[PDB]
Every structure is written in C-alpha cells, then in structure tokens.
C-alpha cells in the first residue's frame, strides 16, 4: 500500500534535471561528428552500439506501443544513413532496407493534423544529404514532391535579416536551413550555450568547428546519458510544473507538501519580470506555462502579479508564439480559462477580456470534433472542458473533478508529440492511477459506514416529525456537502459534527416555515443540543452560539432579510470548536481580519438568497444576472483574504470559511435532477 | 467649585425616607386627637406651637413665594378652628379673623383647572364641623353653594359596597365621607398600617379608638418630625426615582454612580410583578412611575420586562388611575412617549400601540394652549415636547437636550401641587442649576481652545486643496459630531483623534468623487497617516486599518454599494486604539459578539445611504418611508446588544459603537439650515 508512496517520495525527492524518452534520429545527427582532436572515425561508439542493438524484430525503429509511419520513416532511415558514412555492420543496413524500400509509400494516408515540427523542412534535408550517399529509394512518389513544394514555399516567406533577430522554432529546426551566416548566430544563443536546446542545430557546421562554449552541452548530454539522446534538453521547469499540476489534480500530494514547496520555491526564485520558458535560463517565453505557473504559485500561497501577460495582445487575439501568429491549440488557452477565474480587485482587466475571448473561442470546439491538441494526443480533453465550462472555481468541488479525472488519465496509452514520438516517465508514470484509485476507494469505504451510522443516530433521535416529507434525500445531500468538502481521515470529528449541526438547524428552520416563525413558538428549542454526542467543550460552546442563532431568529421576525449568513456562521463556529481551533489574539489584526471575514460571509450569503426565490420564478433577467455578477465581484475579495498568506492566521481556519461558502455556492447553481446522480457517480459505484 | 459636589454627595449618601414641605392643614386634623390614656387636653403641644409661631406678618397661612387663595383659605382657617376647640391664644384667632372675615370672597375667580384633591369634598366637611363651633363667616356667597352642589353630586355617584373594594383616592380623601362602616375598612389598609399614607383619614373615628396598628404611623410622623406634618408619607420610591431622573437629565451624576447604583438596587429589589407605587409596600399601582422606572432601570443596565403594562388597556385608552377613567395629564403619558422608543425584538407590541395612541393624543396640545399639568405647575414643558416629538432616542444628543433644559429648570420658582401647596428640597434643590451651569461652562471653555488648535493644525497641513469649497462649515460640524458625542475631560485623546481621522477620510473621499474613483488613482495616499500626531501604537495600528479602508475602496470600484460602513468601522477601530482598548479574547463569545456588532454597523450604515440620495430627490414616498422603518427595526437590536449587560464585554467599548451610529443618524435627519444654529446654541453664546 505505502510502497507506491515510497516510490513516488524517492522519485520527487530525487527531482532531477530531465527525464525524456531517448530519441534515435538526433543520435545520428550528432554521430556524424568527426573526432575533434585529429582522430580517425566517429566521436562516440556507445551511441552507435545503442543504435544497432535497439531495432525491432521486424526491423522498424521508434516506439513499439504505437504505429505512425510518418515519423517511423525518419527513425528507420536516419539510423542507417550513418552506417553508410562509416561502413559498419552491413547486417541491419540491408535488413532494414528490405523494410523501407517496399514500405516507404504510405505518406499521403496518415492524417491532416499529425505533421511533425517542420516535417517538410528536415525530411528533404535528410534525403538531401542522403542523395550524395549510396542510396536507392523509390524516389518517384507524388506524395513527396507535394511536400517539397511547401518546403520551397516556406524557405522564401521567412525573412533574411530579421530572421537573425528572433530566437524561435526556425532556430530550433535548422536542418532544412542552408547557407546560414554565423556572424550573428553566436550572440543570440542559449544562456548555457546551446542552439535552442538542440544539438542538430549545432551539427550543421559544428562538424569541424568544435566551439566548446557550445560543445560542453553536447558532451554532457553524451557522457551522462550513456546510450542514445533526445533532441531538446534541459526542461526542468517544463517537467517540474507539469508534474505538480497533474499530481495536485490527483489529490494525494498532501503527503508531499515538503517537496511541493521545494519545487514551488525553485519556480519562484526562477521567476522573470518578462515570462517563462521550458527551462531555467531560456529567454524565449510563451503564454501557456507562464500562465499555469502564475496560477499554481498563487494557488499554494505565493506573491504573484499577472500584468506581464500583456505581451500577447494582437488586436484582441492571443497566441502561444511570441510575435508569431499561428493557430494555437486547445490546451494552451484552456489553461488560461482555468487561470482566469480567481480575479482580485487589484488585478488588471486583461484576464476578463481574455476570458470572454477564449470562452467563445473554445465554444466552437465545444460541440465540434476539433477538440484535439496540436502537439499532443489526449485521452479525454472533452471530458476536461465538459467540467471547466459549466463549473467555475466558485463551485468546483475538488473531489468530483478527481472522480472525473480517473477516466481521463491514460498514461502509457498516450504518447506525447514533439519533434519525434516520445513519452515521459516522471509524471507520465503508471502507478499514479493505482495510488489515486486505492486512496479514493478507502475514502469511499470510510464514508460508506459513516453515513450508515449517521442514519441510525438520526432515526433514533425523533427528528423526523420535525423537517418534512422525505428524510433520505436530505440526509444524503447533507452528508455530501460535508464529505465532498472535507475528505481527510484525521478530521472525522468535524465530519460528523457538520452533518448533525446542519441537520438540527434545518429541522427547526423547516418548523419555523410551518407554524409561521418565532412569535408562534410553542416549545423551548435551546435544549435540543443535548442529544448530539457529548464532549468536554464541544457541547457548551456549541449551545451558546446556538442561542446566538436563535437570537437572530427572533431578531428579524419583522424583517425581509434571509437566514443564510446566520446558519453559515453557525456552521463555521461549530467547526472552530469541532477542531479545537483557537488563536492568540494578542494582535489587533486578528479580530480586524476575522471580523471582515465573517462580515463578507453574511454579506454574500444574504445577497444570494434574494436570487434563490427570484430564480425559482424568473420574474426578471437583468435583475437575476445582476445578482450573480454582484455576488462574484466580491466573492473575489472573499477568496482573496481567505487565500492570502500575508496574514498571521492559521491557514486551516482561514480556508474552512471558503469551504462552506463554496458548498452553498455549488448547491445554488446545481438543480436537484443535476445533483442527484452526483452522489451515485462519486460513492455508489466503486472503481476497480 | 467642588463645594456643591460635597453638598450633593452628602445629600445623596444620606438618601432618607422622606423630605416634604411641612403642611399646616392636616396638622390641625391630627391636633384634634384627644389624649389616649385618659389625659386632659391635646396629645402634642409642639405642633400647636409650630402652629402659632408660623403665621405671616399679614396673618395669612401657607407659602410666601406664591399667592393662591383657593388653598390659602383652608390653610388660614383650619389652623384657627383648633384654638376654638381648645380655647388657647386668642391673639391670632381674631388677628386672623380680620383677614378671613373680609377676604373670604375670591373663590369664583381663581382658575378653571387649579382645583385641589376633592376641594369640594373636605371644604364642606371643614365648615361642616366648624358649623357647631363659635364661627361667624360670610355664609352667603353664591360661589360656595355652587360647590356644595357638586359635593351632593359626587356623594351619590360613588358606590356603596364596591366602594369598600378599591384602595383609591376616595380612601385618600375621607374627610367628606360620613357614616363609614369600619368592618371592611381595616383589611384593605396600608401594609405598614396607614390609611392611604394619610392621617386625616384615620382621624375620622381615630379620635377615640387608638388602634396602635395604625397609631405608630401617626406617632412616628409626630415625634421625629418635631413641629408640623404633611399629609402623605412615605414616598421613598416617588422622591428617589424622581431625583435620579432629573439628575441624569443634568449630566453631572457621573461623579455619583455609586449612590446611583444604590438607589437603582433599592428600586430593583423593590420590583413587583404587578406594578409600583409612591412607596415601598403600597399595593395601589399606577402607570406613570412604573413606566419611567422600567425605563431608567433598563437605561442603566438591568433586567426588565414590560408585559405588566397591559393593565391600562381600556378599549385602546390608557389612564393613570387603576380601573378609573379620569382625564389624564400631559406628563403621565409624555413619560411613556419617552419610554416607548427603545423597543427590543422580544418585546410586546403594546409599546407600539401605546406610541401611536399617545403621539396623536398629545398632538392635540402640540399647538393648543392645553400644555399644562393637572397636578403640578411647570416652567416649560412645551420646551420638553418641542424636543421629544421631533427627536427620537435614535438621534438624541445627550448634551443639546441638557443645553435646552437649562432654560427649563425653575426650582424655587415653581411649586408642586398635592392636596395642598408644597415643595420638595431634595431634588427640587436650587444649586443643581449652579452646578450644571458651571460644569457645562467649563466644558465650553475647553472645546473653545480645542477647535482653535485643530484649525491651526489643519490649515498648516495642506489639506485644503483636498476636500472642497468651504473648510469652515466642515471643520465645525466634524468637531461637533465628536464633542457633542464625547464630552468628558479625560478622553481628549479620543476627542482629538476622531476629528482628524474623520477629516482625512472625508478629504480623500471628496478627492475620489472628483477624479472618478480608485482606478484613476495618481498618488499613494497610504503615507498621509504621517502628519497626524505621532505616538507609540497610535500610528501603526492606525495605518493598517487605514489600508483596510483603502482595500475596500478598491474592492467596490465596480459595485453600487456605499461607503458608510467602512468609514464607520474605521472610526471605531480608531477609537479602540485611541483609548488603549483591548480585551482578553480567551472566550469565543468575545469575537462572537464583536463580529455581529460591526456586522450590524455596516448593515445599517449602508441601508441608510440608499435613502440619503433618494431623499435628496424624493422620487418615491413608500420606498423612503420603508427605508426608515427598516433602519429602526434593526437599530433596535443594535442598541440592544450595545446596551445589555449579559455580556462579559467592557461597557465603554460596547457603547462607543452606538456613539457614532447615533452621530450619523442625527446628521441624517437634520438638514443644514436645521443643524447650523445648533452649534451657536450649544457653544457660541455662554450661560451666565
């Protein structure tokens, strides 16, 4: 059980500097490097070995878990083109020529989206240097020249002088780039001395000029890789934040807050006032990882500011590439949909404009079948937008969305797309599913007996002639609003308390709807506290705030204001006692903040109930739509002070407030024949 | 200066059991008592001495400060009728007969209201026993038989058997009551054994049957009075509560809270579940003193409940007499106007019904000249209603009303009315005016230099290009809202703080009206805290709540809610620091109560501003009138929790909240050409 925990604990404590599926095509592009100091043949033989003893029994080259010839052709011939330059091991040269010479024909029947990074740029250059060698391939295919045609298209639309001004993907893909003057190509290089983190871009003229200032990049990625090499490295930021994101989406990272805070610290001290990149020192910035990092850094309590994201505004448009206008994919903006929800009054309206832009911009691929990514395959991203569009953060239960993601994690079944087909292993690891499944299932097993015991305690308590028609459809939802809110095992005291403290108030409120209200009171309710379980301080401190609640009941009996805020503060003061939650108020900001907090609580809770019945009839559109926006435009400040670390307050007590306000915000914008199947979907039918 | 303080301190520490102006008419009514144990003549000679050596040089009898023959005739002849029964001192018998025999003619030219307590009942009985004696008076006056006529009227309308069931004024006035069976007249007697606290009612047949169970009353009021005696005694409750009421109306009792709490304790332990009377054990209850005591006991923090006042409802009517329907006077209901304002949600609607009844019921004598009392003369009671009707407790500055009462206290110039003309000395004492005048005048002298210094500090602070047109008409009212709110000398720190902390917020709010709001901010205001005076903690704790205020400024910039509550809590947190006001929050009810308190603060402060501009135009009647009632119907709960002692909170901090909410409630319902002359009236022109 804890075996998986130890495995991932070591894996994250050993967070390294790169873990990529080893490529085979770039390996030859560097294997052509002559010996630097007047040698005889190749520079490294071990890569050549890894080349020979890593061919599929059928003779193909690439990944075995998937079949995609459009890339398999490059992977299967570029390995051979080196054994022609060095005349070694004629066994598998012609053993693979039998494959390629008869199976290089299915170019024009792949697909219309799955084109590689300049697949029309290097493939010619590949066959271009292969032309001089002893090659004999089926040159005459109409599918190939139909690709040469776009090569000549793209080699002209690119600039000449200004092309020496962008560090961009054209500098990432230099194989199909001939006659490149090197006078300016040296100053715009990677901070550690690489060519866009790729060695093939070096090996254009690196073949004889061994500039160490770029050669330690290569020799490092050779000697410590020990057999084969991918094309792009390092990616520390890329892999790191991508891990923690999905892991927080798993809901089991709580055991690893230490290493969490460590990688957050790395990214934090690695922040630039102009953007972010795949790695630590790359000055080529984009929008997507910058946004998701700005999001997650804030989400775990760090001092963030998004005004830099104004570097993508093209007459209202936005794109991933910097100053470059190419059709973005679904996720590089979907992340921004996720990241735009948590506005603060100090923020800039760019997030809003971007939100209304991207919302409709994705509403195209809402119903249409264009839900696919441009640079990766996915299991169910429509499943992700299915939740993202109809559920904001203000009603985003952090457990039902995990219940949804259990059908969205593929792992081995999905291969990521780069310059070549490759996977990761670090966070694309295949026991995260096993661990999250087991964790959620034991959670399931505990709530199954908790609701059982609550049922017995309830119908043995004569609380049925108080309330109303059907107690089952109320006990289940009441237990849900708590269990789906607080799921840990070490707070079952609060878990059982919230249920009963809501049930009692619900019963008496339903009684006051019946006999009319506080003036027609016939019995003394103050003693109903007795039959909740007994403790040392859980009982008296309970009854006193309970009498405060009844005080309010009597207080408004000739008014028009609702009862939301009082029962809300009832529940939170109940939790404060149900957790032994106390504080050194030796500092005046303590009450300063606690005051405004429970103030906003009643404020929003009463401002929503005026929409409750007005929507139960719908007597006006402008009014209801104004109520909702007025709710959220200060729900922001609520979340803000709940989720800013500048305070000296305990985190847990700051956040349990948001817990219940979110519970009620959810039950507000979900109708019963919407919420009904949610309990089934969560608890009833188990995984595995 | 403190001489008056010592005088009244002794006077109140020596709060006794009765202090009434000594009568002269009842003295003879008991002087006719024969010697009990077989004596010769009268029972006590010293009263007879006090009779002879207390005649005016002109020969009249009564008070010298006022002239009212309708009673002076009784006082001047009843003293003589005894010297006829005992044949002593023929000097002043005939020396007063020269007066009476020629001056007993002005009966029919007194007035139409100033009739004594059954003046038509005893005057006949007086001349009735005088008939048998050697008298020779001008019997033939048509004004006298015109009074005999109503005597025969009233002696028949009274019942026979049920007249033995009410302890009432008919039992108080027994002189004109002949042939009274004594079998039931003994069980309904005063608890100490008196006849409605009057000895003449005994001396009807007490002349020979010396029942000690009623005779110790007489002998006590003889031996320890030592010369003369009034008719009604004891009145401990009557005089006591009447004192503390007017003294609290003086605003100098603060030096005497000890004796205050002592008399409050006496009245408190002297409460009955059925009503109150003049004295401790009298079972004859009324409405007026019961109501004013229920008021003042609550006002100083004691556990009260008014449901008993349902014993006056006569088909909607109310009256002072119990089951008796006689036209009440102005004050016995005016007190209830004063007492009905401070409703609580737990209260009964009797106060409301009574309020709408008595409001219009007095609106008759609002303009009409019928503003006079039935049992007392007054200096200016129209001055009292002049304030009571147009100013509720919710806008009742406790210093402007004292400024008004300085012209309402007459003291010696006014004689109270009972069965005979008499005054008090205890609380109708003539240095209370001197003390209150001196106290208010030194208050005046201190604020005169305080505003002077504030003016210098302000125009030296460059706060003029912020704000608006005329700074004088704002500095004066700002200083007023504080000085008229807090007047003591030992809190000048808070006094000077409130002024500047309101001025700064006012200036920046007026700036935000100008440039549009928080989004068009051009400078950093957070540093404006520096130029208020510097201290150890008065500065930082100030700036932080100040930044909280600015936080709210930014928070609502796209909303429709007002700014009242935030600046209100600003001012109160400023006072909390300007008084070193701190608390042991080791108890959860501390924040429980402080939270709801500042919640109601913002609630009411924002619910009033929506009426502010809507009244500046008046675009609807029902809406504005609903806003005001909705304000007060929870202003009640505000005042309630502010003014209930069931809490463990400090009183001062509970009440400073009410202070400012009242300041703004006043400035709301007073228009500038109403408030303008108030500052003049208070401070500009001094007393003396």
- Rounded CA separation A337/B22 (Å): 92
Whether the CB of A348 is below 8 Å from some CB of chain B: the reply is no
- Rounded CA separation B678/B688 (Å): 19
Contacts of A575 in chain B (CB under 8 A): none
DSSP letters, A418-461, are SSSEE--SSSS-TTHHHHHHHHHHHHHHHHHHHHHHHHHHHHTT
Closest to A413 (Cα-Cα) out of A428, A427, A402, A426: A428
Nearest chain A Cα to B543, which residue? A589
Whether the CB of A555 is below 8 Å from some CB of chain B: the reply is yes
CA angle B160/B163/B166 to nearest 5° reads: 165
Chain A: closest CA distance from residue B553 (Å): 10
Query: Cβ contact (<8 Å) for B555 and A637?
Result: yes
SS (H, E, C) B365-419: HHHCCCCCCCCECCCCCHHHHHHHCCCCHHHCCCCHHHHHHCCCCCHHHCCEECC
CA angle B195/B196/B198 to nearest 5° reads: 70
Query: Cβ contact (<8 Å) for B345 and A630?
Result: no
Contact assessment for residue A466 and residue A508, using Cβ atoms and an 8 Å cutoff: yes
Tell me: is residue B288 an annotated ligand-binding position. Answer: yes
- Rounded CA separation A406/B481 (Å): 64
Query: Cβ contact (<8 Å) for A634 and B556?
Result: yes
Query: Cβ contact (<8 Å) for A634 and B559?
Result: yes
Query: Cβ contact (<8 Å) for A555 and B588?
Result: no
Question: In chain B, where does the domain assigned CATH 1.50.10.130 lie?
Answer: 236-430
Q: Which residues contact A395 (CB under 8 A, 6 or more apart)?
A: A662, A665, A666, A668, A669, A670
Q: Which two tokens stand for residue A606?
A: 């009463």
Mutation pick from B540, B545, B585 vs chain A, by most beta carbons of A within 10 Å, is B585
- In Å, what is the CA distance from B372 to each residue of B161, B331, B338, B366, B408? 36, 9, 18, 11, 14
Contact assessment for residue B588 and residue A576, using Cβ atoms and an 8 Å cutoff: yes
Mutation pick from A596, A629, A634, A647 vs chain B, by most beta carbons of B within 10 Å, is A596
Contact assessment for residue B365 and residue B213, using Cβ atoms and an 8 Å cutoff: no
- Rounded CA separation B48/B45 (Å): 5
Q: Is A515 exposed, middle or buried (0-12, 13-18, 19+ CB in 10 A)?
A: exposed
Contact assessment for residue B321 and residue B286, using Cβ atoms and an 8 Å cutoff: yes
Query: Cβ contact (<8 Å) for B545 and A592?
Result: yes
Top-level class of domain A236-430: mainly alpha
- In Å, what is the CA distance from A466 to each residue of A241, A413, A504, B239? 52, 54, 9, 54
Contact assessment for residue B395 and residue B385, using Cβ atoms and an 8 Å cutoff: no
Contacts of A345 in chain B (CB under 8 A): 551, 554-555, 557
Whether the CB of B598 is below 8 Å from some CB of chain A: the reply is yes
Q: Which residues contact B455 (CB under 8 A, 6 or more apart)?
A: B475
For residue A416, the 8-state DSSP code is: E
- Rounded CA separation B90/B83 (Å): 8
**Number of neighbours of residue A338 by Cβ within 10 angstroms:** 18
Contact assessment for residue B606 and residue B562, using Cβ atoms and an 8 Å cutoff: yes
Whether the CB of A144 is below 8 Å from some CB of chain B: the reply is no
Query: Cβ contact (<8 Å) for B346 and A545?
Result: no
Q: Which residues contact A186 (CB under 8 A, 6 or more apart)?
A: none
Q: Quick check: helix, strand or coil at residue B20?
A: coil
CA angle B161/B166/B167 to nearest 5° reads: 130
Dihedral sign from CA coordinates of B605, B608, B614, B617: negative
Q: Which residues contact B465 (CB under 8 A, 6 or more apart)?
A: none
Q: Which two tokens stand for residue B21?
A: 């102006």
- Rounded CA separation A421/A75 (Å): 10
DSSP letters, B294-357, are HHHHHHTS-----GGGGGG-BTTB--SSSS------SHHHHHHHHHTS---TTS-THHHHHHHH
Chain A: closest CA distance from residue B616 (Å): 25
Which of A345, A541, A544 comes nearest B554 by C-beta? Answer: A345
Query: Cβ contact (<8 Å) for A555 and B592?
Result: no
Query: Cβ contact (<8 Å) for A345 and B596?
Result: no
DSSP letters, B156-170, are HHS-SSGGGT--SHH
Contact assessment for residue A3 and residue A435, using Cβ atoms and an 8 Å cutoff: no
Whether the CB of A630 is below 8 Å from some CB of chain B: the reply is yes
The phi and psi torsions of A459 (rounded to 5 degrees) equal -70, -15
Question: In chain B, where does the domain assigned CATH 1.10.600.10 lie?
Answer: 434-684
Chain A: closest CA distance from residue B598 (Å): 7
Q: Quick check: helix, strand or coil at residue B42?
A: strand
* Residue with tokens 């295949």, as numbered in its chain: A430
Please provide the distance, in angstroms rounded to a whole number, between the alpha carbons at the two ends of chain A: 15
The phi and psi torsions of A416 (rounded to 5 degrees) equal -75, 155
Pairing of strands A416-417, A421-422: antiparallel
Whether the CB of A629 is below 8 Å from some CB of chain B: the reply is no
Tell me: is residue B374 an annotated ligand-binding position. Answer: yes
**Number of neighbours of residue A400 by Cβ within 10 angstroms:** 18
Nearest chain B Cα to A581, which residue? B588
Mutation pick from B345, B626, B646 vs chain A, by most beta carbons of A within 10 Å, is B345
CA angle A470/A474/A479 to nearest 5° reads: 150
Contact assessment for residue B100 and residue B77, using Cβ atoms and an 8 Å cutoff: yes
- Beta-bridged to residue A421, according to DSSP, are A417
Whether the CB of A595 is below 8 Å from some CB of chain B: the reply is yes
Contacts of B596 in chain A (CB under 8 A): 548
| Cβ burial A648-679 (10 Å sphere, 16+ → b, else e) | ebeeebbebbbbbbbbbbbebebeeeeeeebb
Q: Which two tokens stand for residue A401?
A: 């969305």
Dihedral sign from CA coordinates of A251, A254, A256, A259: positive
Which of B557, B577, B588 comes nearest A541 by C-beta? Answer: B588
Which of B555, B594, B630 comes nearest A591 by C-beta? Answer: B594
Chain A: closest CA distance from residue B595 (Å): 5
Q: Quick check: helix, strand or coil at residue B5?
A: helix
Q: Which two tokens stand for residue B632?
A: 């007060």
Contacts of B541 in chain A (CB under 8 A): 588
Contacts of A558 in chain B (CB under 8 A): 345, 633
Instruction: Please give the annotated binding residues of A for substrate, written as ranges.
Output: 154, 374
- Rounded CA separation A643/A641 (Å): 5
Q: Which two tokens stand for residue A447?
A: 């709530």
- Rounded CA separation A543/A528 (Å): 9
- In Å, what is the CA distance from A514 to each residue of A441, A466, A562? 42, 10, 16
- Rounded CA separation B137/A334 (Å): 116
Q: Which two tokens stand for residue A163?
A: 């092309």
CATH 1.50.10.160, domain B21-223, yes or no: yes
**Residue A184's Cα: distance from chain center in Å?**
39
Tell me: is residue B286 an annotated ligand-binding position. Answer: yes
CATH 1.10.600.10, domain B434-684, yes or no: yes
**Number of neighbours of residue B430 by Cβ within 10 angstroms:** 12
Contacts of B560 in chain A (CB under 8 A): 630
For residue B421, the 8-state DSSP code is: E
Whether the CB of B347 is below 8 Å from some CB of chain A: the reply is no
Pairing of strands B421-422, B416-417: antiparallel
Q: Is B181 exposed, middle or buried (0-12, 13-18, 19+ CB in 10 A)?
A: exposed
| Cβ burial A61-92 (10 Å sphere, 16+ → b, else e) | bbbeeeebbbbbbbbbbbbbbbbeeeebeeeb
Query: Cβ contact (<8 Å) for A633 and B599?
Result: no
Query: Cβ contact (<8 Å) for B594 and A595?
Result: yes
Q: Quick check: helix, strand or coil at residue B195?
A: strand
The runs of H, that is alpha helices, within A516-620 are 540-555, 564-578, 588-617
Q: Which two tokens stand for residue B141?
A: 């006056």
Whether the CB of B626 is below 8 Å from some CB of chain A: the reply is no
Whether the CB of B521 is below 8 Å from some CB of chain A: the reply is no
Contacts of A627 in chain B (CB under 8 A): none
Kindly give the interhelix angle for A472-483 and A651-668, rounded to the nearest 10 degrees. Answer: 140
Contacts of B594 in chain A (CB under 8 A): 591, 595
Contact assessment for residue A544 and residue B589, using Cβ atoms and an 8 Å cutoff: yes
- Rounded CA separation A167/A195 (Å): 9
- Rounded CA separation A540/A427 (Å): 49
Whether the CB of A598 is below 8 Å from some CB of chain B: the reply is yes
- Rounded CA separation B253/A477 (Å): 60
**Number of neighbours of residue B333 by Cβ within 10 angstroms:** 22
SS (H, E, C) A319-377: CCCCCCCCCCCCHHHHHHHHHCCCCCCCCCCHHHHHHHHHHHHHHHHHHCCCCCCCCEC
Query: Cβ contact (<8 Å) for B588 and A576?
Result: yes
Closest to A264 (Cα-Cα) out of A234, A301, A233: A301
- Rounded CA separation B686/A487 (Å): 72
* Residue with tokens 């008939």, as numbered in its chain: B131
Contact assessment for residue A338 and residue A294, using Cβ atoms and an 8 Å cutoff: no
* Residue with tokens 């839900």, as numbered in its chain: A371
Instruction: Please give the annotated binding residues of A, written as ranges.
Output: 154, 286, 288, 374
Contacts of A557 in chain B (CB under 8 A): 345
- In Å, what is the CA distance from B154 to each residue of A27, B204, B328? 130, 19, 19
Query: Cβ contact (<8 Å) for B559 and A633?
Result: yes
- In Å, what is the CA distance from A521 to each residue of A241, A525, A554, B156? 59, 9, 10, 51
Chain A: closest CA distance from residue B393 (Å): 20
Contact assessment for residue A122 and residue A175, using Cβ atoms and an 8 Å cutoff: yes
Which of A545, A555, A590 comes nearest B345 by C-beta? Answer: A555
* Residue with tokens 């060695």, as numbered in its chain: A199
Closest to B311 (Cα-Cα) out of B356, B343, B362, B354: B354
Whether the CB of B558 is below 8 Å from some CB of chain A: the reply is yes
Contacts of A585 in chain B (CB under 8 A): 585, 591
Query: Cβ contact (<8 Å) for A548 and B573?
Result: no
Pairing of strands B416-417, A416-417: unpaired
- Rounded CA separation A394/A389 (Å): 12
Chain B: closest CA distance from residue A537 (Å): 11
- Rounded CA separation A94/A91 (Å): 6
The phi and psi torsions of B199 (rounded to 5 degrees) equal -85, -25
**Number of neighbours of residue A115 by Cβ within 10 angstroms:** 14
Query: Cβ contact (<8 Å) for B634 and A602?
Result: no
């Amino acid at each position: 059980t804890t075996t998986m925990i130890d495995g991932i604990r070591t894996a994250l404590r050993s967070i390294g500097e790169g873990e990529i599926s080893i490529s085979a095509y770039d390996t030859s592009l560097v294997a052509l490097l002559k010996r630097l100091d007047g040698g005889d043949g190749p520079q490294f033989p071990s890569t050549i070995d890894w080349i020979v003893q890593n061919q599929l029994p059928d003779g193909s080259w690439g990944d075995a878990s998937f079949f995609m010839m459009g890339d398999r052709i490059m992977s299967t011939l570029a390995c051979v083109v080196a054994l022609k330059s060095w005349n070694i091991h004629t066994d598998k040269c012609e053993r693979g020529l039998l494959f390629i010479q008869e199976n290089m024909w299915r170019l024009a029947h792949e697909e219309e989206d799955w084109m590689l990074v300049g697949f029309e740029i290097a493939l010619p250059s590949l066959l271009d240097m292969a032309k001089d060698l002893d090659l004999d391939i089926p040159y005459d295919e109409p599918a190939l020249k139909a690709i040469y045609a776009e090569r000549e298209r793209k080699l002209a639309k690119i600039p000449r002088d200004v092309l020496h001004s962008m560090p961009t993907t054209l500098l990432h893909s230099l194989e199909g780039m001939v006659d490149l003057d090197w006078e300016k190509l040296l100053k715009l290089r990677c901070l550690d001395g690489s060519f866009h983190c790729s060695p093939a871009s070096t090996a254009t003229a690196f073949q004889q000029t061994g500039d160490q200032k770029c050669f330690e990049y290569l020799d490092g990625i050779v000697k410590k890789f020990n057999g084969g090499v991918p094309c792009i490295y390092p990616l520390d930021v890329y892999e790191r934040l991508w891990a923690v994101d999905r892991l927080t989406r798993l809901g089991i990272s709580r055991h690893f807050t230490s290493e969490i805070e460590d990688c957050l610290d790395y990214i934090f001290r690695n922040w630039t006032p102009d953007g972010l990149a795949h790695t630590k020192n790359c000055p080529v910035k984009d929008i997507d990882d910058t946004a998701m990092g700005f999001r997650l850094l804030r989400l775990y309590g760090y001092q963030v500011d998004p005004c830099v994201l104004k570097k993508f505004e093209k007459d209202g448009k936005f794109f991933c590439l910097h100053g470059e206008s190419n059709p973005s994919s679904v996720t590089p903006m979907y992340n921004t949909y996720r990241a735009s929800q948590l506005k603060f009054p100090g923020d800039d309206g760019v997030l809003g404009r971007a939100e209304v832009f991207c919302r409709s911009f994705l509403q195209d691929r809402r119903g249409s079948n264009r839900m696919k990514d441009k640079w990766a395959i996915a299991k169910d991203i429509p499943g992700e937008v299915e939740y993202a569009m109809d559920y904001p953060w203000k009603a985003s239960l952090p457990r039902i969305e995990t219940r949804l993601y259990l059908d969205q994690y593929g792992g081995s079944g999905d291969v990521w797309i780069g310059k070549v087909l490759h996977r990761m292993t670090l966070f694309c690891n295949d026991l995260y599913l096993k661990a999250a499944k087991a964790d959620f299932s034991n959670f399931q097993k505990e709530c199954r007996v908790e609701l059982n015991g609550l049922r017995r305690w309830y119908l043995r308590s004569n609380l049925e002639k108080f309330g109303g028609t059907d107690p089952q459809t109320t006990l289940m939802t009441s237990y849900f609003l708590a269990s789906a809110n607080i799921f840990e095992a070490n707070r079952a005291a609060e878990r059982l308390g919230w249920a009963r403290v809501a049930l009692l108030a619900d019963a008496v409120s339903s009684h006051f709807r019946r006999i009319g209200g506080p003036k027609n009171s016939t019995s003394n309710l103050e003693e109903l506290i007795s039959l909740v379980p007994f403790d040392d301080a859980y009982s008296g401190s309970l009854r006193e705030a309970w009498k405060q609640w009844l005080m309010a009941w009597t207080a408004k009996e000739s008014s028009q204001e609702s009862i939301e805020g009082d029962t809300a503060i009832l529940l939170v003061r109940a939790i404060e006692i149900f957790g032994g939650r106390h504080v050194l108020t030796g500092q005046r900001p303590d009450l300063w903040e606690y005051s405004q907090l429970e103030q906003l609580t009643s404020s929003i809770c009463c401002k929503l109930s005026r929409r409750v019945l007005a929507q139960e009839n719908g007597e006006s559109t402008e009014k209801v739509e104004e109520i909702d926006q007025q709710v959220d435009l200060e729900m922001q400040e609520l979340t803000r002070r709940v989720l800013q670390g500048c305070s000296a307050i305990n985190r847990l007590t700051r956040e349990t407030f948001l817990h219940v306000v979110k519970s009620f915000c959810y039950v507000a914008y979900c109708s019963p024949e919407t919420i009904d199947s949610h309990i089934d979907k969560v608890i009833f039918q188990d995984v595995i």
